[PDB]
Design a protein around this ligand. Sequence first.
Ligand SMILES: N[C@@H](CCC(=O)O)C(=O)O
Ligand SMILES: [Zn+2]
Length: 258
Amino acid sequence: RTIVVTTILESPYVMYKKNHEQLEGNERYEGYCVDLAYEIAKHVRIKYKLSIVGDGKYGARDPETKIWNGMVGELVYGRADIAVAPLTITLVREEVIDFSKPFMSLGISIMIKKGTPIESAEDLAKQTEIAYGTLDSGSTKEFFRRSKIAVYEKMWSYMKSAEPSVFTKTTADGVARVRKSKGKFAFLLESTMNEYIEQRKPCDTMKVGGNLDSKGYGVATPKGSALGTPVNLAVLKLSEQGILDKLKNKWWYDKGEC
Ligand SMILES: N[C@@H](CCC(=O)O)C(=O)O
Ligand SMILES: [Zn+2]
């Protein structure tokens, strides 16, 4: 009866509450997706348990083993019933799991340490003094790997062979690297994460230029799952009732600091 909700520790979607070590189950976490899961469960009328994905990855298929990892994998192999996280709706994922309509709209963006002489993707691509990377094994890395647009093809060419590696295991590592590189490192991440970090102390980063693409995050369920329909309708109702807007403001700006 209790459905398993796989998710990921990514701020401000899912974070450990101040005194998580003193708590258990769902009470250990807080964040946009923790609230979203609560609201969805309320409309779908289900009991659930949040589960942080073991490998801490979003989801990608190994070209060799063909095995899916991350949250996508938890769904594909039946270990999770639903995924409530900033999981990007992509073609390859849509082929193996189901997605609700978007609960958040975003695009790939550029994060720089304030003062960095960069204003666009073209600016990064035409130079090598400033290094740049992305989260490893996510939709952003795939974007550059698959792009047929000149400027992005140039960027992938650089990152693909960059040494040391410019692909971080977590968004947090990417941000830390930007903050510690004195402006010699820029990070490619989704606007949502970018906008959030920009509102947090030391307030030393900022999003520059427009987004590289336009897409969205969706709540995922195993392909053909009976929860897909109810979850989709729940997402649309939350959207139309302004709750998604309320949650975004709550976790991004109301708790602003810059
Ligand atoms: N939202 C992305 C992860 C973040 C990123 O790749 O920038 C995904 O679902 O893979
Ligand atoms: Zn702790």
